[PDB]
């Protein structure tokens, strides 16, 4: 089996005292590194690092494309939270065509 | 330079795409192909003034119900379509399409449209309906539905025969502009 595991990580350059990072004992050393980078550097200024919200995703099954979002007018609010839209929420079948473009 | 956003909804196979292709490209499709979503842009005249038309062709199937509301925002007029030969599609005008429109588009004008009118004068088809105790939808029944739903107008057309096709969109742009 596996096990949840909270760890204390220190980053030399940033100088923060310590950062709690929730990982799994079955995570590899590469997975753990990216788990840390997504917590210290995803919010650091980097003009060449595309984040999902600095990026548009359109869908066109025909000659016209439409933008798909995590939460738009079609999002069903399930429970305490608004359920984030999925690919089968929009009913995107296999072999579809998408467009990626910056904002 | 006035622009108008037109959106067609209605049960699958009721003839939404054929109506648009005949109006835009002047071509009727013999093979049925379920539409996902398309945007047709048409320049027309209204009382002597040019009016651009952004027209959206939606999916009538139940499998795309979660994607369809994406095209309701900023609408100027809504064409609620049904098949005259299919009493089911005429019911879903009020059972299914009106609640969905009333939910999102509370203020967008509704124009009910009866499609495949040419099929009313087909002996081989109407008798198949009459043997099952069902008659094709008549004008006074399409009108009472538009009245019950609260539509502004109610029109009929046949994409197979180009009849009353250009008139459907002239009335759509007139209602959309006069209500602006
Ligand atoms: N006889 C006749 N057949 C028609 C007429 N309009 C459409 N059809 C036929 O009805 C079928 C459905 O046409 P279509 O326009 O694709 O319907 P739809 O509403 O766009 N389907 P969907 O909503 O799933 O995209 C096709 O086989 C088409 O040839 C009409 O005026 N007369
Ligand atoms: Mg279609
Ligand atoms: Mg189905």
CA of A81 to the centre of ligand 2 (A): 34
Please count the residues of chain A.
Answer: 103
CB–CB of A65/A57 below 8 Å? no
Nearest ligand by distance to the CA of B63 = 3
Q: What distance in Å separates the CA atoms of residue B180 and residue B173, rounded to the nearest whole number?
A: 11
Domain ranges of chain A: 4-40, 50-103
C-beta of residue B23 within 8 angstroms of C-beta of residue B42: yes
- Report the run of H or E that residue A100 belongs to, with start and end: strand A98-102
- Segments making up each domain of chain B, as ranges: 1-180
Contact B35, B17 (CB under 8 A): yes
Return the ligand number nearest the Cα of B89.
Answer: 1
The continuous run of DSSP H or E covering B51 comes out as: strand B49-57
What are the chain B neighbours of A72 within 8 Å (beta carbons)? 70
Chain A contacts of B72, Cβ < 8 Å? 73
**Phi, psi for A36 (deg, rounded to 5):** -80, -40
Q: How far apart are the first and last CA of chain A?
A: 43
Q: Is B158 in the pocket of ligand 1 (CB under 6 A)?
A: yes
B87 ligand 1 Cβ < 6 A: no
Q: Which experiment gave this structure? A: X-ray
Query: Based on C-alpha coordinates, what's the Rg of chain A?
Result: 19
Which overall architecture, per CATH, does domain A50-103 show?
A: Roll (3.10)
The b/e string for B96-129 (b: 16+ C-beta within 10 A; e otherwise) is bbbebbeebbeebbbbbbbbbbebbeeeeebeee
State the Cα angle at A90 between B65 and B10, rounded to 5°: 25
Does residue A77 contact residue A83 with C-beta atoms inside 8 Å? yes
Give the single-character DSSP code of A1: -
Q: List the end-to-end C-alpha distance of chain B, in Å, as a whole number.
A: 14
Q: Which of B38, B66, B72 is facing A90, going by the closest CB pair?
A: B66
φ, ψ dihedrals at B153, nearest 5°:
-140, 180
Q: Which residues of chain A make contact with B16, given a CB cutoff of 8 A?
A: none
| CB-based burial label for B173 (10 Å; 0-12, 13-18, 19+) | buried
Within B25-122, residue ranges assigned H as helices are 87-92, 98-103
Q: What is the CA radius of gyration of chain B?
A: 16
With a CB cutoff of 8 Å and minimum separation 6, the contacts of B148 are B94
B61: nearest Cα among A93, A77, A21: A93
A51: left (phi over 0), alpha (psi -120 to 50) or beta: beta
């Amino acid at each position: 089996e596996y096990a949840p595991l909270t760890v204390s990580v220190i980053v030399q350059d940033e100088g923060i005292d310590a950062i709690p990072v929730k990982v799994l004992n079955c995570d590899t050393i590469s997975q753990v590194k990216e788990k840390i980078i997504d917590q210290v550097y995803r919010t650091q200024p980097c003009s060449c690092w595309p984040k999902p919200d600095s990026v548009v995703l359109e869908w066109r099954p025909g000659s016209t494309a439409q933008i798909l979002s995590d939460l738009d007018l079609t999002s069903q609010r399930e429970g305490r939270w608004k359920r984030i839209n999925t690919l089968m929420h929009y009913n995107v079948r296999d072999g579809a065509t998408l467009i990626l473009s910056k904002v | 330079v006035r622009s108008v956003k037109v959106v067609l909804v209605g049960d699958g196979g009721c003839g939404k795409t054929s109506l648009l292709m005949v109006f835009a490209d002047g071509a009727f499709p013999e093979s049925y192909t379920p539409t996902v979503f398309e945007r047709y842009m048409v320049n027309l005249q209204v009382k002597g003034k040019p009016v651009h038309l952004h027209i959206w062709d939606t999916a009538g199937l139940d499998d795309y119900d979660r994607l369809r509301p994406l095209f309701y925002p900023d609408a100027s007029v809504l064409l609620l379509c049904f098949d005259v030969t299919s009493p089911n599609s005429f019911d879903n005008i009020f059972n299914r399409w009106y609640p969905e429109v009333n939910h999102f588009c509370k203020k967008v004008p509704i124009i009910v449209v009866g499609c495949k009118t040419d099929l009313r004068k087909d002996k081989s088809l109407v008798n198949k309906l009459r043997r099952n105790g069902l008659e094709p939808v008549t004008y006074h029944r399409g009108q009472e539905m538009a009245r019950s739903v609260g539509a502004v107008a109610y029109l009929e057309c046949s994409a197979r025969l180009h009849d009353n096709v250009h008139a459907v969109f002239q009335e759509a742009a007139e209602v959309a502009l006069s209500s602006r």
